[PDB]
Design a protein around this nucleic acid. Sequence first.
RNA 1: AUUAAACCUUGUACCUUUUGCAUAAUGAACUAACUAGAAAACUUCUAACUAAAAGAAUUACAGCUAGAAACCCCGAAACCAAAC
RNA 2: AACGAGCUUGGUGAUAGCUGGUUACCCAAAAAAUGAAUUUAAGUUCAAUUUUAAACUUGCUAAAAAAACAAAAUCAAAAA
Lengths: 55, 78, 140, 105, 97, 166, 42, 68, 121
Amino acid sequence: KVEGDIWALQKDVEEFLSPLLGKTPITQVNEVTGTLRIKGYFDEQLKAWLLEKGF
Amino acid sequence: RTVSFQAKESMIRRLEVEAENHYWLSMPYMTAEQECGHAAERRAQAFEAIKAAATSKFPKHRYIADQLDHLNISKKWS
Amino acid sequence: LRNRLTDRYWRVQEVLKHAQHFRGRKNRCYRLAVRAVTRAFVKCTKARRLKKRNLRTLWINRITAASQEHGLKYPAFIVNLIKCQVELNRKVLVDLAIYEPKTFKSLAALAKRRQQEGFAAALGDGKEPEGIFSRVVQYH
Amino acid sequence: TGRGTSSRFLTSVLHNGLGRYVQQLQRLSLSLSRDAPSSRGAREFVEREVTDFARRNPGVVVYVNPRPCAMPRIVAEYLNGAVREENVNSKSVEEIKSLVQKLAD
Amino acid sequence: AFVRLTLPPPKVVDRWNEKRALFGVYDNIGILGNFEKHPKELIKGPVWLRGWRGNELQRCVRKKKFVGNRMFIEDLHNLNKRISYLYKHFNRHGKYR
Amino acid sequence: ISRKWEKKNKIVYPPQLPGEPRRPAEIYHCRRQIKYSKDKMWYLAKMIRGMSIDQALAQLEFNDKKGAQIIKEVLLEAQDMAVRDHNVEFRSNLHIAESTSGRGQCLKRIRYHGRGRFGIMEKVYCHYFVKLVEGPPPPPEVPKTAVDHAKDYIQQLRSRTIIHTL
Amino acid sequence: GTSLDLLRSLPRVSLANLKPSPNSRKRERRPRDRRRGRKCGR
Amino acid sequence: GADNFTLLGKPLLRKELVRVEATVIEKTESWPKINMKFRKRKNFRKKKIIVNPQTILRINTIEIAPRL
Amino acid sequence: KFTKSRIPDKVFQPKPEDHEKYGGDPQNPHKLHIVTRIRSTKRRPYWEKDTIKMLGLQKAHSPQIHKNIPSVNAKLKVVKHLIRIQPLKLPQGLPTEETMSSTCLKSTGELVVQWHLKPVE
RNA sequence: AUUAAACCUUGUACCUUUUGCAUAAUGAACUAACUAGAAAACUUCUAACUAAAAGAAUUACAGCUAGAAACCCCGAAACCAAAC
RNA sequence: AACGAGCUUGGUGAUAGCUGGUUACCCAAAAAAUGAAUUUAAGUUCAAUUUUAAACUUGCUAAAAAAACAAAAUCAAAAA
Ligand SMILES: [Mg+2]
Ligand SMILES: [Mg+2]
Ligand SMILES: [Mg+2]
Ligand SMILES: [Mg+2]
Ligand SMILES: [Mg+2]
Ligand SMILES: [Mg+2]
Ligand SMILES: [Mg+2]
Ligand SMILES: [Mg+2]
Ligand SMILES: [Mg+2]
Ligand SMILES: [Mg+2]
Ligand SMILES: [Mg+2]
């Protein structure tokens, strides 16, 4: 449930997850549905990450 | 079936070409020991390129502009 | 009959238009016309490759006729012109023979001239200097 | 199909290039619908490309006729008297521009 | 093939007749009406397939279940034979086992 | 069924101008549902093609075929309407420009055979058409002379071109 | 939401402009052409 | 070549000697050429049409200069 | 049974006359091979088919450059009869970054680094 | 292809099968019309909402809901019941 | 008007591992007819192949010695 610039979120997600992977994550942006899809399981890291941002 | 004159020559010509091929394969520039490892780096990188493409498959992005551009089919002169 | 094809007239005319110059029922009866048209198209496609080869055979015959008038066989005319670094092709050599007989005689003299030098050269054993017309213009 | 069709020899209309080159295309007609999906690309051609084509080719007279129409159609007439008609129904702007240039050449 | 030698009469369609103009109204009777009625209750049709869908064997069995006892002898005999044919087709014949 | 042959006698051309050759009259006539094979009628129709009206009648009067009397009766009717309705001056000044036979509507019947087998027989009908053109019959066919044959041969030689070359 | 600003520029939405979501519909194949006709896959 | 003489390159003549000028008169496409192969169940529609762009050039002049 | 063949080593031991005939020094051996396919692998066993694709010689009469090292030579000996092996020669030296775009491989086997298409003069 | 319809050159009808083979063997006088792939258990794609989904009864340790996506035609000798 | 068992209607769209047929275009890939069981060998199910999609990492050719044999394949370090 992403509103606004879904591409800005992709940029932040890639930077946040890149050190953990050691490589850029593969992601899909569905601008029609408003969702961002990432290859691999990163739910816990992204859940904690989004809490810090205050969403 | 007697073998023709032209047939016999064409085989000989090919044999001479292969005979020379023997000579040029008889003088290796490097020995077996010296060969080991001289191309390791290039081989290592090449496989990484192969793996990277294989493991990078994922669906494509979807844009609103594609869906909304369909409305232009009813574009008109006012 | 909710849905019946309504365009079969034009589908039929697609085949029959190609068959109108045949003879017999091939030219108007679709079941027979369709089989004939498919053989005509296959023949046309294969004839496209064959046409190029037949034209070359025609040129070689015409070149042989022209060169024999001056006393030269076809192999002697062609190879010795090549040995002079003249790269005229067989199609053009026929045009010169039919329409430029004086030029073609010059080519025959040049080809015979180079041929004679080759005969002397082989007997020369390499000590003799190379022929005037046997010199090769180098490129780099 | 060679023997089922006519043939001719290579030729030019009036020794086209011996003294001076003359463009054989002399008239282009474009029929449009003001509001019809199939004529959209032709409408964009008129807005953007028709004026430039006319200036580049000052010997061709170009007629643009917006009218209630089911299929846009291009009619090309040459100096020798030949007429060629092309259905432009639901073609993109680029295809129409590409086709129009072929008629001129 | 033979083709018409004349144009048929042009078809005249009134797009703003009452039925076309008001098509779809009350399809949200439930969500906009507190769910007192489900939209399927607005479907007009055979009693055995109002608000229901199925394959032909299912439709044949459903019609018999609903109005089988009010059917004519010719119709009921034909319907019963259709069930047995479809039963054998779906349960014994086909590419996929 | 179509009946266009009858309609052809209704064509009206505009008045000819003084400086023009006089247009020959043309008369179209037919008899439709004749109990006779069209294949058989072709021979009678073929024979009179190109002959004058009187010459055609003379040959038909002494033919033993059933179709000859039918064609003769049609020819006489065509002759009368030509003078009576089509402004033909002299009855004799007419020749057969066109004469042919066509299929009619036929009836299907049963042909009995030996063992309860049958066949479908056809009761055949045919049509007969003629056009009469005012004027003497066109001059007969003249065979080519030897000189004419030689001339055509030389033209073929002179038409030769050098093929598949500049 | 800039996407809503895009709607302002575009022509009216209507029953003539409708389109399904991409790839939402597969193609149904009938045994009519040579590829899927003939023995029909059996 | 001329009536009384010819010059032959080995294989090409020098730019100083010969200048040949041509003009583009027409840019066109070939007539439809049918390409149909032979195959089991040939059919009439297993057919391809090849149309190729074409150019027509008029040769304008051939000139020579005394630079032998 | 048709099977893979092992050539006796004596075949690849040259003779002094061979060096004179082909003009190759047994010392300072050439570094790179020029190999072209001149026969078809149709009607040849699959192992010969495999190596031809490994070596890049899928198209005929198109030259491929290969290392003159024993491992490569072992593969070449398998398909020796379907190829022509020519020593790569560098009359003017290896191509540099400046001359990398001006090279041309001659039929003689020489890689020239300057290609002018002009009379030698 | 050709200046030229035929001459010259090239060319072992179609379908079905037979082992991938046709000088085999079936089928077709020709025209017109008619004349034979049909279902959602699992899987895939597209969306809604999401530790929940579904307009009652069902599934759920990211699921669940909806959509789309599928499986021919003609032909026996027979057998049985009731009439004639 | 063709009885080892009449004819008509119905059951009935009987059934047929058998014969025949199975209607537009384009692109791509492609087995093999091997092993096993079957009143099974005119069929079917499984293996094996082939194929589509997805996941992530070594595969193919080659392969020293060295064993196993008896005194060209199996295995497969390094490399290329
Ligand atoms: Mg050839
Ligand atoms: Mg009798
Ligand atoms: Mg008859
Ligand atoms: Mg095939
Ligand atoms: Mg038999
Ligand atoms: Mg289906
Ligand atoms: Mg009886
Ligand atoms: Mg059956
Ligand atoms: Mg069986
Ligand atoms: Mg048993
Ligand atoms: Mg290894």
